[PDB]
Design a protein around this ligand. Structure first.
Ligand SMILES: OC[C@H]1O[C@H](O)[C@H](O)[C@@H](O)[C@@H]1O
Ligand SMILES: OC[C@H]1O[C@H](O)[C@H](O)[C@@H](O)[C@@H]1O
Ligand SMILES: OC[C@H]1O[C@H](O)[C@H](O)[C@@H](O)[C@@H]1O
Ligand SMILES: OC[C@H]1O[C@H](O)[C@H](O)[C@@H](O)[C@@H]1O
Ligand SMILES: [Mn+2]
Ligand SMILES: [Mn+2]
Ligand SMILES: [Mn+2]
Ligand SMILES: [Mn+2]
Ligand SMILES: [Mn+2]
Ligand SMILES: [Mn+2]
Ligand SMILES: [Mn+2]
Ligand SMILES: [Mn+2]
Lengths: 387, 387, 387, 387
């Protein structure tokens, strides 16, 4: 009955289940959680681990002794439960000093501060065992055209990521970076707005091998993009270092519904791809239990994330294992798509009359793709309606 | 009075002014144009040049002698007018054989055919003087999840572009490639859906220096993205080889309004960026005169493309030259955004107490960005309402 | 195994399965169907009926004898199969004369012509047994602000619908009208763009009781609206005269995927509502088998429409019948939402201190809605994963 | 130089300039304003008036004496400045008790409380001279399908508005209601999501003449709708009681940019319509100075709202007064759109052979609409580029 265990690698941000329900139009509807209680409740549901921003774990402004006690208690809860911390990140968005950005703030002093605040937390992340360090440039961008020269901003972004790569290399840390795209919100337009923009940017860094992406289901959907396509491109590039799983209903504010909510068919095709490709990172949920909910509803929502992943994984596996689907996939020439177009080489292609002068374009045109039949087999699998 | 001349480098696709007004719900409202007449009418309006798909210039299915006559007449009109042909491209979308794609069709034979059809037209393009060869993968993608393994598809896309780079290198041609993104339409989701995805893909090709992007105003807007931001990223990467200028009202079907229509402020910020960055390629319009229009309306629409570019160029130049705007730009710290964050290096940043231990975060936070004032100066410039 | 029969009331437009696959960027990929063959193939799949535009059944420009023969053959196929014709409509979009609209064309002569063309087809529709006559104002609107004074246009729309109501009343026909909204495409913005706009407009007609809506799943989704919410408002108003069922992936061009594709959860909640409310009209599919498909794929796609409706109907029924869901619905106070807020009346509400002066707002606030648990029960039902 | 004065009727919400800059991802960047200071600063900029939610003017939880002092001080500032209060509204969204709605909360007690809280503020609004009372059902809706039966919810909405109409009638108040649509945010989908849905709903209330709409530029744009079209429909219905003016860049979170920002051409066509139709209500701004800004930037942003309205009003007036535009409007048959289609009546239309049997559809089809030329005249006017 789709019961998660820690071997499923399901992780949650402290800020997910810990969200107090403050939105732009309303006050908190739940009390703050102690991170220790979250670790414990998550462990009991079958989670593998948690993730954190610096400021989720240690209140902004903490003294050294406060900080040490917060980490001690957190460490104890990890030890008490067997929970891991596979990823951490910096809060470069909440404090008003970040109003125009961290790494790409117009104020140089803010940019230096952002870097120092990040580096401090990289050390903690390594201490707690994290393998991935996420950057989410939520304040990087603009509401107006004159406010942000984007080429200068990208020069500053590159400089910041380059410094961080220098830093981790200097300490001999194994931790890698993952850039999390989001196209807008809270800035009118955010820099590196999609998986593609982040991938492209990475290839200009000094040490590109240190940086991948942390794509979020809802964020690519906020641009109307196909999330499984973006993930496939990321996998193709060898850069799917981490993922954020959740739900989103179309192009609107960032909803952060529980995974499986939102675009259910996209969630099926995502799980199909992750499993087929052998993604081996954390199955991380970045979701907000709706503010309608009390604490019991919080845990139900979190449980549903993991349940939905496990149901979808079962249905996708059944799909790809069904001989009738295997025959449909052949009928639709998915096998041919996987073959080289011209392993014979350029000159042979140019000399091949069956590729042009004698290619019967009408007979090719007339051959149906059989994609609808294929897709209804997939529907029938997803819904458990195989006849 | 904003009169274009050929030195402004304004170009038009044959298929733009030549669009007969057939849409998915209706028949043509205008007769087909002879390319010769289009060259002549465009020249008379002050255009620099035209662009073409193979099948715009030579009807699909033409005999060798037909083809030779079509090119002869076209060449004569170019010679008669002084018009250039800076760019060409392949029609890999109209014929039913391309229903599942060209380069990423599931049918291998179709993929080979697509390559041969492209290579034939590369030779013609070079003969007519083109410097850029555009690819627009409009049929590459899917309506359903099972129909297209995207990693295999990207393997096939890479293979196709690699073969084309091999081909041009083999002939000693100077022509370069530009990939034109579009996120959807006519496929439910199109591969390389944005400028970012195309940039990232390019970095995996064998000879990345041969490939840039041809971003279109309306296409990035179809994903709700900020077109001037995308162009800036493209410029940052050194990959703005060509551009398509037009208008689009938000996230909907591809409207291809005349340039300046649609998102007028985005058009102002685009022209500001292109001019500030010194983009020196063609100012190419990919637009559709609405099907409401007759031939006189066609030419009025095309004239308006060039007029709007020239008005915006004047207003943007006035903006950046106004000492009052220069002072506002300083007040908003755009000068600081252009300075390195830490030219002193990593260790100096780590040892700089003013970056962290003694950084007054509240005083920084309290400093307004003054972006609204800046933006109203920009509004006042755009509208010619300076007091 | 979810086999449809005619008692399920599933209907298809001739133009759905008959779509030849011409899109704005490509030629037809299938031959034209004879309406007789469509009736027969649909009947064999378990359909109840078909619908038509005038010009689907009788080619535009037909002679009286041609017209009579087309109708004869169609009638014979209906008689041969037991198929019905519950709805008909006018093509006021394809011919170039409708380029600026039918009923709201700027040219008065076009507007009169649109009315005459509609009235002719109303007579045929009644002859073939239709109970609903759909209007889809696809050409009514604008690409630019100056082209269409919308108040004058709505005066013309009202005039046209009023004349049609006069006409049907004059003939003693029982047929009613249903306005089908679409927000854009093929016009940049279409008048009466949503269910709400159409409902509101209807209340200004001379005989509002003669007019309802024909909402389409994909069209409301093209504005990012919640289709089941729109249907509920339509049901609330007593105006759900007919429906178009299909799928759509977000805000983009009108995709017309088979029903169940697109937003699968919205399709579940739609079927839940239609069945719960006792909608008794046709379950009509307005879909396009993708142009990738051959004729076999056409019929598979159409079969899948009906299959998906039947699977969803089963899952929704199981949901609402499950005692555990009934208890969750109580826990979430859906029973209370159905009770009057103040059946005691205004003065009693004003005098009720428990409504204000002594209302414990914090205790109310603290009561979780339990909506996540409810929603995962719904997920588990939809997926057939009840434990 | 486009200097506003109180005769321009420009109004601002206390919550607009008073927004402290808290967003879902960050803390306030400005201190709270005293409403008295806002009245004074707004008056100095040339505003006519302010608007308020109950809880903007009197802190939630105030004692009777606190309340009396808050109103006293506010009244004094109004008297000191000559500012008016043309509109007021209720906060039925901030307090956690409204997490599932006010008027359509599932909890009946919450619904009664919402009504009492509204009625209390109606009395204050009348005391301060307001002519319009706005309802914005921001918490009315759902994130999941099972949580909200929408027909029951609309029964509750109708009941609430009916009670409020009973109340104002009982007191002999002249104040009227205006429903402000928003399609989503903070609920996943909000009930009455557009101008159309609100118009339609109004026609089912007991006393429909008491209720109009308060459409907001950005909210209709959040559904990709054409705001000037929606306003025209509202004007057509006689229901434009009040308006919210601001800017929005497409389909995304509710940005509330200063008026003129966002979609500049839509702002031009809006002002053209409001002025042409003789809208005589407040020109009310519901905007958020971006959180990047300090207090000086707040006032600059607010000034820019009024400036942009005045520039657009000048350009639109020049457009409609230009004899060359008047001739273009005739060329495009806008004069004909304003004439009745068939003032001769139904039988005469049926007997008119020039409407059908002898209508030359090809000659009509061939007549260009000349809309592009018209639209470039409008562009040239907007930009001050008339040659
Ligand atoms: O980077 C970690 C997280 O930071 C913030 O909480 C963002 O809203 C979220 O999307 C991101 O995944
Ligand atoms: O690639 C050349 C052109 O091909 C097609 O006409 C596309 O619709 C267009 O966007 C593109 O710019
Ligand atoms: O009105 C009947 C039909 O006409 C057209 O085919 C439209 O594209 C479709 O949505 C509509 O349902
Ligand atoms: O109803 C008054 C106002 O309430 C809230 O502040 C809303 O966010 C806003 O759009 C609305 O106009
Ligand atoms: Mn998110
Ligand atoms: Mn995230
Ligand atoms: Mn385009
Ligand atoms: Mn293009
Ligand atoms: Mn449709
Ligand atoms: Mn339809
Ligand atoms: Mn708003
Ligand atoms: Mn508002």
């Amino acid at each position: 009955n789709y019961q998660p265990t820690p071997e499923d690698r399901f992780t949650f941000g402290l800020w997910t289940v810990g969200w107090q329900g403050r939105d732009p139009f309303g006050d908190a509807t739940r009390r703050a959680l102690d991170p220790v209680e979250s670790v414990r409740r998550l462990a009991e549901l079958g989670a593998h681990g948690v993730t954190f921003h610096d400021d989720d774990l240690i209140p902004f402004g903490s003294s050294d002794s406060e900080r040490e006690e917060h980490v001690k208690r957190f460490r104890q809860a990890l030890d008490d439960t067997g929970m891991k911390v596979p990823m951490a990140t910096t809060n470069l968005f909440t404090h008003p000093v970040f109003k125009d950005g961290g790494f790409t703030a117009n104020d140089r002093d803010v940019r230096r501060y952002a870097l120092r605040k990040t580096i401090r937390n990289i050390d903690l992340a390594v201490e707690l065992g994290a393998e991935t360090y996420v950057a989410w440039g939520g304040r990087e961008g603009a509401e107006s055209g004159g406010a942000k020269d984007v080429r200068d901003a990208l020069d500053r972004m590159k400089e910041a990521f380059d410094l961080l790569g220098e830093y981790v290399t200097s300490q001999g840390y194994d931790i890698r970076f993952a850039i999390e795209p989001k196209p807008n919100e809270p800035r009118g337009d955010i820099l590196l707005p999609t998986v593609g923009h982040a991938l492209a940017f990475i290839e200009r860094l000094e040490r590109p091998e240190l940086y991948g992406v942390n794509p979020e289901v809802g964020h690519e959907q906020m641009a109307g993009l196909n999330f499984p396509h973006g993930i496939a491109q990321a996998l193709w590039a060898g850069k799917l270092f981490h993922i954020d799983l959740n739900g989103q209903n179309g192009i609107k504010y960032d909803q952060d519904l529980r995974f499986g909510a939102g675009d259910l068919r996209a969630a099926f095709w995502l799980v199909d791809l992750l499993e087929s490709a052998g993604y081996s990172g954390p199955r991380h949920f970045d979701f907000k239990p709706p503010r309608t909910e009390d604490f019991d509803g919080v845990w139900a929502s979190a449980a549903g994330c993991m349940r939905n992943y496990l149901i979808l994984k079962e249905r996708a596996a059944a799909f790809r294992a069904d001989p009738e689907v295997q025959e449909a996939l052949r009928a639709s020439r998915l096998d041919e798509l996987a073959r080289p177009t011209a392993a014979d080489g350029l000159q042979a292609l140019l000399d091949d009359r069956s590729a042009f002068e004698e290619f019967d374009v009408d007979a090719a045109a007339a051959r149906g793709m059989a994609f609808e039949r294929l897709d209804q087999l997939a529907m029938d699998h997803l819904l458990g309606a195989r006849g």
